Amino acid sequence: LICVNENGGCEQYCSDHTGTKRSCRCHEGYSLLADGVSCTPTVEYPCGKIPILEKRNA
Amino acid sequence: IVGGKVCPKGECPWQVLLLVNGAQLCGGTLINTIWVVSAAHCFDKIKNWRNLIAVLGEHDLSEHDGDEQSRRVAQVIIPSTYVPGTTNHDIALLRLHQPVVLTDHVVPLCLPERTFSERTLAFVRFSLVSGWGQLLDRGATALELMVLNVPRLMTQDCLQQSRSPNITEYMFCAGYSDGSKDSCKGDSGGPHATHYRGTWYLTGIVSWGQGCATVGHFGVYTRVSQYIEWLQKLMRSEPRPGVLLRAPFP
Numbered sequence: 001l002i003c004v005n006e007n008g009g010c011e012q013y014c015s016d017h018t019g020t021k022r023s024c025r026c027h028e029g030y031s032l033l034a035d036g037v038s039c040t041p042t043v044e045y046p047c048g049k050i051p052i053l054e055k056r057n058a
Numbered sequence: 059i060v061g062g063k064v065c066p067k068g069e070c071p072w073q074v075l076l077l078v079n080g081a082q083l084c085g086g087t088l089i090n091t092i093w094v095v096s097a098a099h100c101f102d103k104i105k106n107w108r109n110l111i112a113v114l115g116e117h118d119l120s121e122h123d124g125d126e127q128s129r130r131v132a133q134v135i136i137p138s139t140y141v142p143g144t145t146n147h148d149i150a151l152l153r154l155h156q157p158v159v160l161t162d163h164v165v166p167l168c169l170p171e172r173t174f175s176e177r178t179l180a181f182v183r184f185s186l187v188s189g190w191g192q193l194l195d196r197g198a199t200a201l202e203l204m205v206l207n208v209p210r211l212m213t214q215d216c217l218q219q220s221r222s223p224n225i226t227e228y229m230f231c232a233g234y235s236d237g238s239k240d241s242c243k244g245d246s247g248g249p250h251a252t253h254y255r256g257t258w259y260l261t262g263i264v265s266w267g268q269g270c271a272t273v274g275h276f277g278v279y280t281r282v283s284q285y286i287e288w289l290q291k292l293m294r295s296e297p298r299p300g301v302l303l304r305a306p307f308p
């Protein structure tokens with residue numbers, strides 16, 4: 001995997017490393033799941049989410 | 059905003075209203091609890107830098123519902139490359155005097171990493187632009203916050219399709235060329251927000267255009283990806299006395 005294609009499969013941020021290595025990262029207020037790609041909020045009001053819509057679908 | 063719709067209250071929770079002596083100045087975008095991104099050109103004629111207020115949680119300018127939060131603007135930071143009276147480098151970073159409190163109606167938009175923004179977000183076709191600007195060219199501004207989905211153009215295509223400032227590498231075009239739907243005067247400084255895999259990100263600032271909803275012309279946005287490192291460094295810096303700060307760019 002490489003960050004240029006399909007964002008390296010990352011939900012949020014992608015870093016290439018020497019070899020066939022890739023690491024995904026998440027913005028502040030999120031943590032990376034064990035899939036190594038998905039980011040989940042760790043705070044009540046993470047950036048870039050709409051609380052009234054996130055509550056409508058929970 | 060021309061040809062858009064009312065943003066349902068709380069659905070644009072990052073939108074900022076900037077006031078100068080209580081009068082509408084411009085929009086902005088909250089990117090964390092003390093930091094707002096707006097357009098440099100909004101600040102060319104400020105006489106009293108100490109009467110600039112940012113309002114979060116605003117929706118209907120006619121009423122007070124209790125979700126609004128007002129803050130004094132403590133610092134307006136503009137890139138050294140911006141020249142008043144011109145269009146390029148049209149970005150400002152505003153530090154609030156006290157943090158806003160995040161609530162269902164007050165949430166920051168994510169400031170993406172540069173690589174992510176350039177390689178991924180730049181190819182998401184449609185993004186949202188919002189504001190209390192004019193509803194029509196030469197028309198009244200909006201009392202309720204408005205929002206519009208607009209598609210982004212590659213610059214070569216914007217230039218080919220358009221028919222005067224250049225579109226520089228610090229800008230991009232978005233919108234429609236049929237006169238139907240656009241950003242407008244008064245929306246300046248507001249967000250162009252891009253959705254990717256469940257999260258929204260800041261990709262542009264409403265900046266300029268030839269008229270509004272002008273046939274053969276598109277809205278022009280500040281290309282925020284050029285400024286990510288500049289913004290991030292400033293947000294790590296201590297404040298300096300005096301509201302206006304010109305900071306080197308790059």
Ligand SMILES: CS(=O)(=O)N(CC(N)=O)c1cc(Cl)cc(CC(=O)Nc2ccc3nc(N)[nH]c3c2)c1
Binds near residue numbers: 148241243268
């Ligand atoms: C002429 S100047 O001296 O360069 N200067 C004066 C000043 N500093 O006030 C200035 C600079 C910039 Cl960058 C922008 C404007 C106003 C503007 O174009 N607003 C606007 C906003 C959104 C739009 N969406 C569309 N479709 N059209 C739009 C228009 C003025």
Ligand SMILES: [Ca+2]
Binds near residue numbers: 119120123126
């Ligand atoms: Ca209100």
Ligand SMILES: [Cl-]
Binds near residue numbers: 107300301302
């Ligand atoms: Cl001052």
